[PDB]
RNA sequence: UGGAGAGUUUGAUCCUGGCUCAGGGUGAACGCUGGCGGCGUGCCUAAGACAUGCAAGUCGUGCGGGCCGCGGGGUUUUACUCCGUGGUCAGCGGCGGACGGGUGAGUAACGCGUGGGUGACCUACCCGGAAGAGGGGGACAACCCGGGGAAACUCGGGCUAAUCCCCCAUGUGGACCCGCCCCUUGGGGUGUGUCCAAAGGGCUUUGCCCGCUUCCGGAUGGGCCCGCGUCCCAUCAGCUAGUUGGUGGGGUAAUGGCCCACCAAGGCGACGACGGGUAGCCGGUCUGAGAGGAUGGCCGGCCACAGGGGCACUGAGACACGGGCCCCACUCCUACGGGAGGCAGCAGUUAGGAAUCUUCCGCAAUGGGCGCAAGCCUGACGGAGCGACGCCGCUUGGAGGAAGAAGCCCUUCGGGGUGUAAACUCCUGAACCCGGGACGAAACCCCCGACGAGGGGACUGACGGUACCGGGGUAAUAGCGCCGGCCAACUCCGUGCCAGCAGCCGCGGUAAUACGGAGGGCGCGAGCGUUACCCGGAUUCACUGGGCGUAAAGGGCGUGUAGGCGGCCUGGGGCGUCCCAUGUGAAAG
């Protein structure tokens, strides 16, 4: 099963996440399918998410399942939003 | 000692046999239908394939076949079968095979 | 693509196969002279058609034995015996080159 | 955008040639020294042996119970017996245990790299689409009874539920044989015949939620095959009997001598077969002007292994590290018959070694498994800890201060040096004290809306009273190497071919800028030296970029096999060569 979720890629203390697809039994920070997004938690910068809304969409339309946290940044990022 | 996920190997044995058994139905069946036919005996000889065409696609419905591996199982049978009656028979019963 | 080669049928001594020897010239990687380089593959006959002499091209294919993986696509040129002569010699030399016996 | 050379063969010279030095690099170790922080990094040896603890489970919304409670019923009462509910324990069943973590022993191989093939294939959970779940029967644990064994555990007897197993039905549809069409490898239709389906559970209870069944497609993950690339020895030249191909079988998801019977006698090799030696491969890493050389340690990808050797079972997936069987070696229990283990998971012990860390904190974040959820489980992981092991940042103060104290040093006996250095004057204020004190965390859940979109609400921090901000405030660690030339930096004393130094050349035989001390000086500085190893200089294996009359090097000479190379003119082809477009060249670096 693909997921769509958060890989850890900041330094120690300094966390920054790569949100991407990837098949659910890869190690969390190894090969990835694809890369849609990355965010920092801290907003240490005015741009702090970013998405790409279609190939997140896209992903969902084949059963990418993402992680209860890639899915609030993917909602926060407007992916869901269907109005 | 213990982690009771021996469970699993507990339970491998329950399924080894219901296999097993499945299995040494088949193969058996199978000879006796080719069997039927290296005697020309084209009446018994489809009623017995017939059966163990059956034997076999119901051992595909769980773990025990599955697959095209019941799909060769049937035709090698179901071929060996038709060429064993080509040597002087017509298809008497001619249940299990196409006109 | 299936890969396709063209090459020289050096044998057919086999029940539907046939040995099929193709170079390729190329320049050489730290010297930069251009060298010859050969390799044979059998190739799969299957209605002992072609004879040797005929200068085929081979298919890349489902394999019919281990070796065999090409099945020989089509007929260029025949007769040519240049080349199986040449292929020949090249072997019956092996004769020397030991410390046994035999003229090469 | 990129290229430095030097010392040493002679009385002297040119050349040849080796040796050596100046640079860079490190998972280092060693000596001397040692102040704070951030980020990294840390068994190179024994893939030796391992104490103790922790490391993969979860679901009561699949099922029936055992033990301990509490409460309510049937009778006038007892007896027996019915229902509800709290806790707990395992059993049956489902999914996970094939990932995640560890290692590099084996492996020179389609193992890896790269580009392709599959009409020769598989793919649990996820997404999309089409159709469906009607009737009936069964067994085994649990539990109950009995037996053997020291123990591990084990045998027999009797009940029993299910989303456990089975039979019949329905056949959307699929599978198999034969025929026909299209296609061209086993791909896609189509006709007769035969064969094959399902499971229930939950409630806010007539409708939703989660499940189940068959088929088609998608996504993701794999299997197999192929072209080309992948170390050293030819003082390893012949190698092969399933060997090479055929037919027919077995086997598999699937091709295949993968295996088997029968038949043919083939297959491979100087373009290096066979054998031996060494090695996980790659992205990358170091070095280099580059071409090249060296390497594969952190991290990421693939492969292989889980005390050594085999093997299969169960599964979508294993030949399965914390699953099963057997043989071997070793440790442990033993009532002598018999049993139990497997850190190359996290820590840790011991051994070997020049040498390599805490039996720490937390599931708060990210990720994973099961669960409808609440949750549970994660030594994955996020953090802290030790070590100057590495990088980066930061301090041991700043401005004044004599025509120049003391001591030590030298001297031409006038002086000259350490040196603005110190003392001392004033100025800031590492350490340290006090106060505030984080970001990382908004989702899951709950409410409105519809369980959608959307809006509202609540909970949660290991690191950590840390980072950071504010106030108070002390002049407050300096070492190590070197000073003949190469190579920055010279003077006294001691020594007398001794004691010693030494990277190379070389110093020491009584006036030593080369040894040991001192003063002074040069270079770096929380480091400085040493040893080891790689590239460099080394055009010193030369493709770029060398040579062979006398420095090393022309085969004693021919004949000639393979191979390399090949005059002038025209035409075809387009292999090499060149050009355009396009795909691939993951991330990290
Ligand atoms: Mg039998
Ligand atoms: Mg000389
Ligand atoms: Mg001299
Ligand atoms: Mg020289
Ligand atoms: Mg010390
Ligand atoms: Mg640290
Ligand atoms: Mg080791
Ligand atoms: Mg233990
Ligand atoms: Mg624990
Ligand atoms: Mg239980
Ligand atoms: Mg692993
Ligand atoms: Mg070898
Ligand atoms: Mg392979
Ligand atoms: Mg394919
Ligand atoms: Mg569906
Ligand atoms: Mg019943
Ligand atoms: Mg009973
Ligand atoms: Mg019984
Ligand atoms: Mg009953
Ligand atoms: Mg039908
Ligand atoms: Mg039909
Ligand atoms: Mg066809
Ligand atoms: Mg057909
Ligand atoms: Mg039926
Ligand atoms: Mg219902
Ligand atoms: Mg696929
Ligand atoms: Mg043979
Ligand atoms: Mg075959
Ligand atoms: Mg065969
Ligand atoms: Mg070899
Ligand atoms: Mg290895
Ligand atoms: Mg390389
Ligand atoms: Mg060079
Ligand atoms: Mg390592
Ligand atoms: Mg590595
Ligand atoms: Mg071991
Ligand atoms: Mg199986
Ligand atoms: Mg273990
Ligand atoms: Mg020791
Ligand atoms: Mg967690
Ligand atoms: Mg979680
Ligand atoms: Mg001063
Ligand atoms: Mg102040
Ligand atoms: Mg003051
Ligand atoms: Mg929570
Ligand atoms: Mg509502
Ligand atoms: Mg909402
Ligand atoms: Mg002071
Ligand atoms: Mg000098
Ligand atoms: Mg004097
Ligand atoms: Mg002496
Ligand atoms: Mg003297
Ligand atoms: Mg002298
Ligand atoms: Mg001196
Ligand atoms: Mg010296
Ligand atoms: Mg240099
Ligand atoms: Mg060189
Ligand atoms: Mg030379
Ligand atoms: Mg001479
Ligand atoms: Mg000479
Ligand atoms: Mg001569
Ligand atoms: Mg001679
Ligand atoms: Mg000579
Ligand atoms: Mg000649
Ligand atoms: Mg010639
Ligand atoms: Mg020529
Ligand atoms: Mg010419
Ligand atoms: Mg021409
Ligand atoms: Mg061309
Ligand atoms: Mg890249």
Known sequence: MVKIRLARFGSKHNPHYRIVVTDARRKRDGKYIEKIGYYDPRKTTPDWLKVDVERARYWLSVGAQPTDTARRLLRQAGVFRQE | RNL?????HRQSLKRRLRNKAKKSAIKTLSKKAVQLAQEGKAEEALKIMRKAESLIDKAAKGSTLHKN????????????????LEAAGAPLIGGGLSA | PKKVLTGVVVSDKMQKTVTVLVERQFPHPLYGKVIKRSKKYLAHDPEEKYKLGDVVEIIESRPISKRKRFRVLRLVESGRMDLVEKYLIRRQNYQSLSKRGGKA
Do not use: G
């Not at chain 2, 009771?4 to 699993?8: M, T």
């Not at chain 2, 591996?69 to 064993?84: F, P, Y």
């Open chain 2, 69 to 84: 591996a019941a799909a060769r199982r049937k035709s090698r049978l179901m071929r060996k079968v038709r060429q064993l």
């Open chain 2, 4 to 8: 009771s996920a021996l469970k699993r």
